[PDB]
């Protein structure tokens, strides 16, 4: 379906700055975040691939100057099982 | 070394200071059938025996032959927990 | 004149692989829903294809002008699109479901223990998977030609065989199938039951 | 019955990339994911005996770049009790 | 009131490998697993005491290949209060 | 001489591609074969007739376009095919050990081939179809004469379907396609056969 | 046919641990063992090339704890005459 | 089924010593001996898991004073296929 | 009488791999195998001289990589007494 941008920040402030810069930086839909415990939270955005890529590469710049960005990755087309099994939005 | 059931627990308050941190258990000696009948000796746990288990304990100088009860005034210690009792071809007791 | 109108609910992967190997168009993948329409004369099939494409979002692979006949394949993942395309095709020709010709089996045989001196000939005569020496062979000819892919598809849905050749355009739709004796027997029973269970005009 | 494969990543992003490459690399069902807290998230896939092996060997490659891969392991035939007592897809 | 085997692994994957090895070693009953947070997962096993002993010794050897084994311990017969006050699958 | 391999007994599927590809006698599965690529490729037209007349063999394949001319001769008795091999290697007066040793160039397995790759791979028609969702081993042997031998050694090793084996060229590209375990079991034998030949470097 | 997996151990005990690890590791079939004298015993399983490969690997890593393995080898597609001539459990009749 | 104890000794007097000690040590059925040729003789004993685990350790202690022991092992739960196609006493 | 080819190996795995290469390599008849004790097992194929001499070369080259080839030899025409006395398959 739509692409999959997500960045993981050890801390909530860096992840909120990430989500704000991603939804201001291009046309992506912040479907939410995920808590894997231990300080980590992961912000997830969905959209078309150029907007998702331009959103993550600006959210990483804006959340790098706040907190501890663990990992940034963009999936251009996730498989239908990954959308159907994981809390990423677009679950049928 | 004789086998008996762990009937109870004994909680000493003022004790010899080496044997603090050491659990004490009223073991009454049972027959190899598995029913307790005899005198109850307050012997020291070294394996982790609870109430109702059938154990071996060993009294004497060979009650101190453990890392736990090395130079302690321990008259008898529990060295093993019975799982099976074979008596001439009939398993009288199982765990 | 509608000769063949057959709706395939799901493409089994050897048939979709064979169509992706030997078609002139947008190659179909396995799992899609397909539709085969063969009409006469074989140049009104461009008008049929234009009606189906302007109505729905189905996608063509096989659009073949034969000597006298004309074949159209359309396919999409959503069966509602393919059924709406078929409804548009039947409305453009102003015919019905049972206006098609009833398919006739004119040669069905199960050749068992095929020699190497025949498998080399069959291998340099086809495009699908290679028949191997010793494998059984099921040959099938259906009139009209467009129903043979039906005889292909149900012969893979109910068995585990290899597709050797299927020619769905011409005067006789031809089908070759290789595999072991039980698997060719199951595929043959399934395909002969699939062709005979199609109503139409005799 | 079906063989089991697991990727454990300390982040969510690495787990999503591992799960994506496991599904894209073999005809292998993605059951889901188990959170254990502390960051550690495990993606659990299940399928044929060698398809799951190629899926884990291609999901490990993907998750080592966008994350920190803790444990990759395939069980070629797990017991009835393991599927009956763990959240691993084939619970009856 | 059978015995009690516990293998604690800081990974989930090492826990499932210890689980499968403990079940395939002897005739023991695997209840499930305890998540105490922070990554630490524990596999819990019930059976007669020598079967549990051999089961945990096989499960520890299979789990040291995969993850970090914290603790392996066998209680021969837990107390009634232990089974009733801790989630160990023999609650009346 | 660039390559001189003797496929002693052709497997049941390599000879089917040898029948679907060759210009000459069609090989039956599986008699024997001798493949010899010897540079330059204008002496192959004069070496093939001597081996066809001296033995009971039948020539199957032909030259390469503007290169050394390969020749695969297929007889039923392995003694006759070995005699035809000695005749073709004595017409050029080169030694049987003077072959160029085969060098593997690029081996790569690609598991779970998508349907797009299935179409683009099946469109180049040599052998058995790509079957979307599979594996695909694609090796390359240098020189191109050894590669058909690899196609035998992947058919006697596992139940993999052969996609293409191009023996005629500068390097021999061989792609096979089966299930994900049989393709690994076949690629191991293809590499272990192409890396075990003896000859000059 | 079915894929072939063998583990030869110089000892009966390592052979039995190998055969038990193979039949618990995957879905294979222990069809028997071959005594060839001198202490050499070969455990033979049949199955599928994925299953036999994944089983024979665990049989080797469990038979090295006990005895000594001499040979471990998987034959993914043995010939018909070899199943007809050697005691490999797929003999017709 | 029943657990499996095996002691393989290169001697023959060592095997009878080991089999005698494994019988005297616990309620274990001596179920045979396997002559694999070349000196190597295996005593195969078979009973419950606690019985075999005590007996086989005692037989290991006894066989090492008389000959050269080769291998000592216990399978706590032998698979059904193992007991089928092997001369291990519990074949049906 | 047919030509005679034999590969003797210490081991049974080496013999089965040698017999597979001899049967797959040429059109010969795998008769059986002679167990001369001590771990040595000999595989005996019989067929035409070029067929046996190709099968033998391939069986030697394949059994060198799993085992312990003792002797590898081809008789192109055995004597009649050799077939009548020794168990080489063609006993009249």
Swiss-Prot record, chains A, D, E, H, I:
Tell me how this protein is used.
Answer: Artificial BMCs can be made in E.coli by expressing (Hoch_5815, Hoch_5812, Hoch_3341, Hoch_5816, Hoch_4425, Hoch_4426, Hoch_5814) or (BMC-H (Hoch_5815), BMC-P (Hoch_5814), and 3 BMC-T (Hoch_5812, Hoch_5816, Hoch_3341)). Cargo proteins can be targeted to this BMC. Artificial BMCs can be made by duplicating this gene with a 16 residue linker between the copies (making an artificial BMC-T). The shell assembles into balls with holes where the pentameric subunit would be, and can be used as a model to study assembly and permeability.
4Fe-4S in keyword set: no
Q: What is the effect of changing residue 27 to A?
A: Forms larger hexamer patches, increases hexamer stacking
Identify the GO cellular component terms for this protein.
bacterial microcompartment
Highest taxon above the source species: Bacteria
CDD domains given in the database record: BMC_CcmK_like
Primary location recorded for the protein, binned into one broad class: other
Annotated BMC domain ranges read 3-87
Location in the cell reads: Bacterial microcompartment
Q: Which Pfam families match?
A: BMC (PF00936)
- Sorted UniProt keywords: Bacterial microcompartment
Coiled-coil boundaries: none
What family is it from? Belongs to the bacterial microcompartments protein family.
Q: Which PANTHER family match?
A: BACTERIAL MICROCOMPARTMENT SHELL PROTEIN PDUJ (PTHR33941:SF11), PROPANEDIOL UTILIZATION PROTEIN PDUA (PTHR33941)
Q: How does it assemble?
A: Homohexamer with a small central pore. When purified protein is examined by atomic force microscopy it dynamically makes uniform patches about 35 Angstroms thick with hexamers in the same orientation. In the BMC the concave side faces outward, with the N- and C-terminii exposed to the cytoplasm.
Put simply, this protein is called: Bacterial microcompartment protein homohexamer
UniProtKB/Swiss-Prot annotation, chain B:
The record's statement on gene disruption is: Not essential for BMC formation; when an artificial operon without BMC-P proteins (Hoch_5815, Hoch_5812, Hoch_3341, Hoch_5816) is expressed in E.coli BMC shells are made.
Would I find Repeat among this entry's keywords?
no
What does UniProt report about how this protein is used? Artificial BMCs can be made in E.coli by expressing (Hoch_5815, Hoch_5812, Hoch_3341, Hoch_5816, Hoch_4425, Hoch_4426, Hoch_5814) or (BMC-H (Hoch_5815), BMC-P (Hoch_5814), and 3 BMC-T (Hoch_5812, Hoch_5816, Hoch_3341)). Cargo proteins can be targeted to this BMC. BMC-H can be modified to place its N- and C-terminii in the interior of the shell (called CPH). Fusing proteins to the C-terminus of CPH allows targeting of cargo proteins to the lumen of the organelle composed of CPH, BMC-P and BMC-T1.
Q: Does Phosphoprotein show up as a keyword for this record?
A: no
An example Gene Ontology cellular component term from the record?
bacterial microcompartment
Q: Which SUPFAM superfamilies match?
A: EutN/CcmL-like
Matches recorded under Gene3D superfamilies = EutN/Ccml (2.40.50.220)
Cite the BMV domain residue spans from the record: 1-83
Q: Which cysteine residues pair off into disulfide bonds?
A: none
Q: Where in the cell is it found?
A: Bacterial microcompartment
Which controlled-vocabulary keywords does the entry list?
Answer: Bacterial microcompartment
Summarize the subunit comment.
Homopentamer. The base of the pyramid faces outward.
Described by its record, this protein's role is as follows: Forms vertices in bacterial microcompartment (BMC) shells. Expression of 5 proteins in E.coli (BMC-H (Hoch_5815), BMC-P (Hoch_5814), and 3 BMC-T (Hoch_5812, Hoch_5816, Hoch_3341)) forms 40 nm artificial BMC with a molecular mass of 6.5 MDa. There are 12 BMC-P pentamers per BMC. The shell facets are 20-30 Angstroms thick, with 1 of BMC-T trimers protruding to the exterior.
Curated annotation (Swiss-Prot), chain C:
Q: What is known of its domains?
A: These proteins have 2 BMC domains which evolve independently of each other, giving the term pseudohexamer to the trimerized subunit. Although the homotrimer fills the approximate space of a BMC hexamer protein, the BMC-T trimers are more compact. Their universal presence in BMCs indicates their structural importance. The homohexamers form pores at least 5 Angstroms in diameter; in the stacked homohexamer 1 pore is open and the other is closed. In the BMC the inner pore is fully or partially closed while the outer pore is closed.
Q: Where in the cell is it found?
A: Bacterial microcompartment
Which key words are in the record?
Bacterial microcompartment
Q: Describe its assembly.
A: Homotrimerizes to form a pseudohexamer. These stack, with the concave faces together, in purified bacterial microcompartments (BMC).
Domain BMC circularly permuted as annotated: residue spans: 1-103, 104-202
> Biotech: how is it used?
Artificial BMCs can be made in E.coli by expressing (Hoch_5815, Hoch_5812, Hoch_3341, Hoch_5816, Hoch_4425, Hoch_4426, Hoch_5814) or (BMC-H (Hoch_5815), BMC-P (Hoch_5814), and 3 BMC-T (Hoch_5812, Hoch_5816, Hoch_3341)). Cargo proteins can be targeted to this BMC.
Q: Which residues form the signal peptide?
A: none
Q: What organism is the protein native to?
A: Haliangium ochraceum (strain DSM 14365 / JCM 11303 / SMP-2)
UniProt keyword Zinc present: no
Intervals of motif Pore gating residues: 66-67
Tell me the domain of life. Answer: Bacteria
- This chain belongs to the protein called Bacterial microcompartment protein trimer-2
GO CC terms in record:
bacterial microcompartment
* UniProt keyword annotation of Ribosomal protein present: no
Swiss-Prot record, chain F:
Q: Which domain of life is it from?
A: Bacteria
Q: Which locations, inside or outside the cell, does it occupy?
A: Bacterial microcompartment
Motif Pore gating residues is found at 65-66
Give the record's keywords alphabetically. Bacterial microcompartment
Pfam families associated with the record? BMC
A cellular-component GO term for this protein: bacterial microcompartment
Q: Which SMART domains match?
A: BMC
What Gene3D superfamilies does the record point to? Answer: 3.30.70.1710
Give the principal location in a single coarse category: other
- Span of domain BMC circularly permuted: 1-102, 103-201
Query: What InterPro entries does the record tag this protein with?
Result: BMC_CP, BMC_dom, CcmK-like_sf
Q: How is it used?
A: Artificial BMCs can be made in E.coli by expressing (Hoch_5815, Hoch_5812, Hoch_3341, Hoch_5816, Hoch_4425, Hoch_4426, Hoch_5814) or (BMC-H (Hoch_5815), BMC-P (Hoch_5814), and 3 BMC-T (Hoch_5812, Hoch_5816, Hoch_3341)). Cargo proteins can be targeted to this BMC.
Description of the deletion phenotype: Not required for efficient BMC formation; when deleted from an artificial operon (Hoch_5815, Hoch_5812, Hoch_3341, Hoch_5816, Hoch_4425, Hoch_4426, Hoch_5814) being expressed in E.coli, normal BMC shells form.
Query: Subunit info?
Result: Homotrimerizes to form a pseudohexamer. These stack, with the concave faces together, in purified bacterial microcompartments (BMC).
The family annotation for this protein states: Belongs to the EutL/PduB family.
Protein name according to UniProt: Bacterial microcompartment protein trimer-2
The major lineage groups are: Bacteria, Pseudomonadati, Myxococcota, Polyangia, Haliangiales
């Amino acid at each position: 379906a739509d692409a999959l941008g997500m960045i993981e920040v050890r801390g909530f402030v860096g992840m909120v700055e990430a989500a704000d810069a991603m939804v201001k930086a291009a046309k992506v839909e912040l479907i939410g975040y995920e808590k894997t415990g231990g300080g980590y939270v992961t912000a997830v955005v969905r959209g078309d691939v150029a907007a998702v890529k331009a959103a993550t590469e600006a959210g990483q710049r804006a959340a790098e100057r706040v907190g501890e960005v663990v990992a940034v990755h963009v999936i251009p087309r996730p498989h239908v099982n990954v959308d159907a099994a994981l809390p990423l939005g677009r679950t049928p | 070394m004789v086998l008996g059931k762990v009937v109870g627990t004994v909680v000493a308050s003022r004790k010899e200071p080496r044997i603090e941190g050491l659990s004490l258990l009223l073991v009454r000696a049972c027959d190899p059938d598995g029913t307790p009948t005899g005198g109850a000796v307050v012997c020291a746990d070294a394996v982790g025996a609870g109430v109702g288990e059938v154990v071996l304990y060993a009294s004497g100088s060979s009650a101190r032959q453990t890392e736990v009860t090395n130079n302690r005034p321990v008259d008898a210690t529990i060295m093993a927990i019975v799982d099976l009792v074979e008596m001439g071809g009939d398993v009288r007791f199982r765990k | 004149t509608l000769r063949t109108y057959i709706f395939l609910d799901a493409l089994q992967p050897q048939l979709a692989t064979f169509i992706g190997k030997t078609a002139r168009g947008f190659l179909p993948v396995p799992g899609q829903a397909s539709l085969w329409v063969e009409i006469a004369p074989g140049i009104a099939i461009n008008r049929v294809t234009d009606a189906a494409l302007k109505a729905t979002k189905v996608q063509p692979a096989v659009q073949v002008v034969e000597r006298a006949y004309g074949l159209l394949e359309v396919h999409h993942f959503d069966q509602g699109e393919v059924l709406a395309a078929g409804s548009t095709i039947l409305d453009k020709l102003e015919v019905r479901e049972e206006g098609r010709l009833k398919p006739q089996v004119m040669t069905h045989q199960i050749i068992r223990a095929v020699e190497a001196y025949q498998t080399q000939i069959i291998n340099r005569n086809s495009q699908g998977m290679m028949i191997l020496p010793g494998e059984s062979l099921f040959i099938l000819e259906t009139q009209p030609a467009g129903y043979a892919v039906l005889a292909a598809n149900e012969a893979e849905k109910a068995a585990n065989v290899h597709l050797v050749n299927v020619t769905p355009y011409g005067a006789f739709g031809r089908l070759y199938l290789a595999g072991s004796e039980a698997e060719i027997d199951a595929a043959a029973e399934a395909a002969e039951a699939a062709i005979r269970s199609v109503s139409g005009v005799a």
